[PDB]
């Protein structure tokens, strides 16, 4: 649980800062300069550059995004994403990892065999360096008019040590042997315009000099030219530090890589620290040529850099992204359908709430802005929709992405019951009970009082005093129960038999006018420990026919279940 | 609908880039330098500074966050959020806008009158500059031991023109008149230690020289000192450009503001370009002292900067954030209850999917990392949990925030949890789902089920339960005793134990045959109904057999009791 930090403030911590040291294990984590290496770059220039052109985009939604889904794309969902990317204006699209996945293989075959690839589109496929995998990759691409074969191997300090147990020379040979195999296979497949991409995977965890050495060595194998360049893609496989440091690394690589005119320098930033978009934008200013990402940031864990945010961040500062975002709702609908994951309410440009103002003051300012625009428009005999957007609080005209400005004018049962009472209510009980609270805001204490009054407290018509359980020694034997109960205050013996104690008690009640059928049942521990309490929840149809829930809490799994039956009976009556 | 860009490429566009001009109305938008001003800071130092200490945090969840909600927080939700922020270790908390909101006013009264404010916590309240609003703000804070009065007015080029139609002097007067009123009201309430914060609102749309002019003028009125500093909060009310430009602007303000030693320089980034976290981190390196934000990036439009991401971005690089995130799911659940908005599946540190690996090769690399750490710990006679985290693909030990690394396996309308429920009637507890997926990692529905049965259901060695006699006390709270006939590696033996029920009695009975079973959690649910009714039981236990391993067991039987006993046996045999 959360324990308030109580350790001494740092020596020299300002008097106006009363924060205390936490007990989080910070010593298990090192500054980036110590984990990897310090910054090699001198006289950086990216801080002085403002982006004034679109990068070359590559959309990796169909492979890198797809790999990240709990419900992977069906062939129909794949075609719909492919079609969306084509219609938006993307010209490089990663379509699979065909040597690793038969469904990827079959998808690549399908788009090639059906003639589904536009003339200005280059499909891209991922492969590891193993020769049999590169062969299978070329097989999948057979008959493509053009293709990027993207090969990679992990180069990071960490992976060399603990994953590959290999030295720098061995790891570089993995890459150059892979490059040689690609060159061999390309010569065997005529017609196709083969293009190559190499990634030193886990680049952000790799020494820059080494990443440069491996890239250069791979380039020497491929022998690219300005007309037929190679792509070096430098991923933040884990986003390990601040975007300025990533950008410094990009500028250094851009300045130091051999044969630079024949290189397309590509970025592939993940979002582990929340700064993928920033890494991409600063990295582009640092000299990169190309950015790989996904629509709305899909990709493993925190995702790939968001292509929508990057593109509209250009548009909103007067630079054409060369991609159509005129109908962001259509893009969002299609992405949600394809991925089966929602765009968050606050996602830049696309989110439900991003063009909303709930504040009277902000609303008024927005309207003053719109009015001044309309006055300037009327004066210049212009359509206001063609004038410079000048509106407080709205970075863009929502209409320019097909959206609108909105001047907009639950009891928490599950949360409160679990947090304050250690009860995880079955969903249908949550529903059953929250309705009561609606009628009966209700404070946390009031909610509990009502819960106890309905489920826990009642002892009429039925009260269970004590009982004797005669359980079967042998698996599948009969269990008997005799209980002392009160029925509207009148002490009564009941007795029944069944496959277990819960069944036995249910059957015993029938003799006394309660026809009870158990429809569902749940139980959970209420603390750690051998002798911990149990909470039981029983859903039952009760005649003297209403279906109701009951709740029981007790030291024994058995007794909690019996209490839950009594609770249900009393609720039915 | 969507029409493919079809305009010419740019002059100078490389032949290897076939992109075409879109029909997006880019002419309606200008570069930041033209919209606002050129920000040139040739001799900037922030690019060469690595953050080495936590900033002073201020959580604005109860104000900026609250105002951004579809459904504003009820009094109970406000209190729950306040308590969460205090418990995490926040010392400055913006509790509301009491001069503008009666519910905010009543909340501030509540927390003051009920003594909910710790002695190391300073509440902060937002106010506009109208003198009657400032008066109401001080009245809301009546009785507080200390409080920050945060007053603001909009200073942007655009707002001065179209909202106020005012000159620089007029707009500055709004602020200095507010500052004057604050000084007057503070003298009337000598029982409270008053502190001030001024924001030139829409700062990122304001000329830096003007922002400095207005802040300086407000500071001359307030007359702060190093012992009693003023906070100047510089908001990216709209995030207008890239975070390096924001950072340049902060370094410039930090160098140029008058009486800098009497200033706490505060950042308040919004996320309209998706770069708020970056703007905060570069801005802090630029010389800021303080950062305002919200847990999980709640707030106006795209949100305030995420305090959770900023905090754990320090932790994961060896800097103590001075805030406790050791149970991120508790923070998440509380936030979702208060805001009634979900934390997204991919949200840094807290999202559902952020400690998962779906890739086989990543899963293998993770296993190798974990193994190599364990080998190093054994060599050093150290707890692996105390050592340098060295695991590919996982920036932090998920356990350091209360979470668990999860290898996700695809089942060939799928997934392990879903198929187990649909095809076998079992609702696997989440931790069991994770454990079993790791077994599979080390698939077809049949393969999955066969693996599950072999792991949890089939083993009869070392332990097999033959029969048992359960003597349950009749009266509530009485002791249960058990005798059981068991086979231990095939040899039949009798065991005996007592506990608060049959499960506990059985667990205790096993201790005498060299199985130490320490029950951590337990779940049970119905399968089917009537005469065909069964119970599935799940027990999580720390098991030691004559090291300890945390394992799940599963038991299925017609009796709720027998199912639970089967689950204990299952766990023991899994541990072996
Ligand atoms: Cl039963
Ligand atoms: Cl029990
Ligand atoms: Mn990726
Ligand atoms: Mn704000």
Curated annotation (Swiss-Prot), chain B:
<feature type="compositionally biased region" description="Polar residues">
    <location>
        <begin position="14"/>
        <end position="23"/>
    </location>
</feature>
<feature type="binding site">
    <location>
        <position position="63"/>
    </location>
    <ligand>
        <name>3-methyl-2-oxobutanoate</name>
    </ligand>
</feature>
<dbReference type="Pfam" id="PF22615">
    <property type="entry name" value="IPMS_D2"/>
</dbReference>
<dbReference type="GO" id="GO:0003985">
    <property type="term" value="F:acetyl-CoA C-acetyltransferase activity"/>
</dbReference>
<dbReference type="InterPro" id="IPR000891">
    <property type="entry name" value="PYR_CT"/>
</dbReference>
<dbReference type="InterPro" id="IPR013709">
    <property type="entry name" value="2-isopropylmalate_synth_dimer"/>
</dbReference>
<dbReference type="InterPro" id="IPR039371">
    <property type="entry name" value="LeuA_N_DRE-TIM"/>
</dbReference>
<feature type="binding site">
    <location>
        <position position="270"/>
    </location>
    <ligand>
        <name>Mg(2+)</name>
    </ligand>
</feature>
<dbReference type="GO" id="GO:0005737">
    <property type="term" value="C:cytoplasm"/>
</dbReference>
<dbReference type="InterPro" id="IPR002034">
    <property type="entry name" value="AIPM/Hcit_synth_CS"/>
</dbReference>
<feature type="domain" description="Pyruvate carboxyltransferase">
    <location>
        <begin position="55"/>
        <end position="329"/>
    </location>
</feature>
<feature type="binding site">
    <location>
        <position position="268"/>
    </location>
    <ligand>
        <name>3-methyl-2-oxobutanoate</name>
    </ligand>
</feature>
<feature type="binding site">
    <location>
        <position position="558"/>
    </location>
    <ligand>
        <name>L-leucine</name>
    </ligand>
</feature>
<keyword id="KW-0479">Metal-binding</keyword>
<feature type="binding site">
    <location>
        <position position="64"/>
    </location>
    <ligand>
        <name>Mg(2+)</name>
    </ligand>
</feature>
<comment type="subunit">
    <text>Homodimer. Remains a homodimer in the presence of L-leucine.</text>
</comment>
<keyword id="KW-0028">Amino-acid biosynthesis</keyword>
<keyword id="KW-0808">Transferase</keyword>
<comment type="pathway">
    <text>Amino-acid biosynthesis; L-leucine biosynthesis; L-leucine from 3-methyl-2-oxobutanoate: step 1/4.</text>
</comment>
<feature type="binding site">
    <location>
        <position position="533"/>
    </location>
    <ligand>
        <name>L-leucine</name>
    </ligand>
</feature>
<feature type="region of interest" description="Regulatory domain">
    <location>
        <begin position="459"/>
        <end position="576"/>
    </location>
</feature>
<dbReference type="Pfam" id="PF08502">
    <property type="entry name" value="LeuA_dimer"/>
</dbReference>
<feature type="region of interest" description="Required for the condensation reaction. Not required to bind substrate">
    <location>
        <begin position="409"/>
        <end position="576"/>
    </location>
</feature>
<dbReference type="InterPro" id="IPR005668">
    <property type="entry name" value="IPM_Synthase"/>
</dbReference>
<keyword id="KW-0963">Cytoplasm</keyword>
<feature type="binding site">
    <location>
        <position position="304"/>
    </location>
    <ligand>
        <name>Mg(2+)</name>
    </ligand>
</feature>
<feature type="binding site">
    <location>
        <position position="237"/>
    </location>
    <ligand>
        <name>3-methyl-2-oxobutanoate</name>
    </ligand>
</feature>
<dbReference type="InterPro" id="IPR013785">
    <property type="entry name" value="Aldolase_TIM"/>
</dbReference>
<keyword id="KW-0460">Magnesium</keyword>
<keyword id="KW-0432">Leucine biosynthesis</keyword>
<dbReference type="GO" id="GO:0005886">
    <property type="term" value="C:plasma membrane"/>
</dbReference>
<dbReference type="GO" id="GO:0009098">
    <property type="term" value="P:L-leucine biosynthetic process"/>
</dbReference>
<feature type="binding site">
    <location>
        <position position="268"/>
    </location>
    <ligand>
        <name>Mg(2+)</name>
    </ligand>
</feature>
<feature type="binding site">
    <location>
        <position position="270"/>
    </location>
    <ligand>
        <name>3-methyl-2-oxobutanoate</name>
    </ligand>
</feature>
<dbReference type="GO" id="GO:0030145">
    <property type="term" value="F:manganese ion binding"/>
</dbReference>
<keyword id="KW-0677">Repeat</keyword>
<feature type="binding site">
    <location>
        <position position="531"/>
    </location>
    <ligand>
        <name>L-leucine</name>
    </ligand>
</feature>
<comment type="similarity">
    <text>Belongs to the alpha-IPM synthase/homocitrate synthase family. LeuA type 2 subfamily.</text>
</comment>
<protein>
    <recommendedName>
        <fullName>2-isopropylmalate synthase</fullName>
        <ecNumber>2.3.3.13</ecNumber>
    </recommendedName>
</protein>
<dbReference type="GO" id="GO:0000287">
    <property type="term" value="F:magnesium ion binding"/>
</dbReference>
<dbReference type="GO" id="GO:0030955">
    <property type="term" value="F:potassium ion binding"/>
</dbReference>
<dbReference type="GO" id="GO:0003852">
    <property type="term" value="F:2-isopropylmalate synthase activity"/>
</dbReference>
């Amino acid at each position: 649980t959360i324990v308030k930090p109580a350790g001494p403030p740092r020596v020299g911590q300002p008097s106006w800062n009363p924060q205390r040291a936490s007990s989080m294990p910070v010593n298990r984590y090192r500054p980036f300069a110590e984990e990897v290496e310090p910054i090699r770059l001198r006289n950086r220039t990216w801080p002085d550059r403002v982006i004034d052109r679109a990068p070359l985009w590559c959309a990796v939604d169909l492979r890198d995004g797809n790999q990240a889904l709990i419900d992977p794309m069906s062939p129909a969902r794949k075609r719909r994403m492919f079609d969306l990317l084509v219609r938006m204006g993307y010209k490089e699209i990663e379509v699979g990892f065909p040597s690793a996945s038969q469904t990827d293989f079959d998808f690549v075959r399908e788009i090639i065999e059906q003639g589904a690839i536009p003339d200005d589109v280059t499909i891209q496929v991922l492969t590891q360096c193993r020769p049999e995998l590169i062969e299978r990759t070329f097989q999948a691409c057979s008959g493509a008019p053009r293709a990027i074969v993207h090969f990679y191997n992990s180069t990071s300090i960490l992976q060399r040590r603990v994953v590959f147990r290999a030295n720098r020379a061995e790891v570089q040979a993995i890459a150059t042997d892979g490059a040689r195999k690609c060159v061999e296979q390309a010569a065997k497949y005529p017609g196709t315009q083969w293009r190559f991409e190499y990634s030193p995977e886990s680049y952000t965890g790799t020494e820059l000099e080494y990443a440069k050495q491996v890239c250069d060595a791979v380039g020497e194998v491929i022998a690219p030219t300005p007309e037929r360049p190679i792509i070096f893609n430098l991923p933040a496989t884990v986003e390990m530090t601040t975007p300025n440091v990533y950008a410094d690394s990009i500028e250094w690589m851009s300045r130091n890589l051999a044969n630079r005119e024949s290189v397309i320098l590509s970025l592939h930033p993940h979002n582990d620290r929340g700064t993928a978009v920033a890494a991409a934008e600063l990295g582009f200013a640092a000299g990169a040529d190309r950015i790989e990402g996904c629509l709305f940031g899909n990709g493993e864990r925190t995702g790939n850099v968001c292509l929508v945010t990057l593109g509209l961040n250009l548009f909103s500062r007067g630079v054409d992204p060369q991609i159509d975002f005129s109908n962001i709702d259509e893009i969002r609908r299609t992405v949600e359908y394809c991925n089966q994951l929602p765009v968050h309410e606050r996602h830049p440009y696309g989110g439900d709430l991003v063009y909303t103002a709930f504040s009277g003051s902000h609303q008024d300012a927005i309207n003053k802005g719109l009015d001044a625009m309309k006055l300037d428009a009327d004066a210049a005999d212009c359509d206001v929709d063609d004038m410079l957007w000048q509106v407080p609080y709205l970075p863009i005209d929502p209409r320019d992405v097909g959206r609108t400005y909105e001047a907009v004018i639950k009891g928490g049962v599950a949360y409160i019951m679990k947090t304050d009472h250690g009860l995880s209510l079955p969903r249908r009980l949550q529903i059953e009970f929250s309705q009561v609270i609606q009628k009966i805001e209700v404070s946390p204490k009031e909610m509990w009082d009502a819960f106890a009054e309905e489920y826990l407290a009642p002892v009429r018509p039925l009260e269970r005093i004590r009982q004797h359980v005669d359980a079967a020694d042998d698996d599948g034997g009969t269990t008997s129960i005799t209980a002392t109960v009160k029925i509207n205050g009148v002490e009564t013996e009941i007795s029944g038999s069944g496959n277990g104690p819960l069944a036995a008690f249910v059957h015993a009640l029938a003799d006394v006018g309660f026809d009870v059928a158990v429809l569902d049942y749940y139980e959970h521990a209420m603390s750690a420990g051998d002798d911990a309490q149990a909470a039981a929840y029983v859903e039952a149809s009760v005649t003297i026919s209403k279906t109701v829930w009951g709740v029981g809490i007790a030291p024994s799994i058995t007794t909690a279940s019996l209490r839950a039956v009594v609770s249900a009976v009393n609720r039915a009556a």
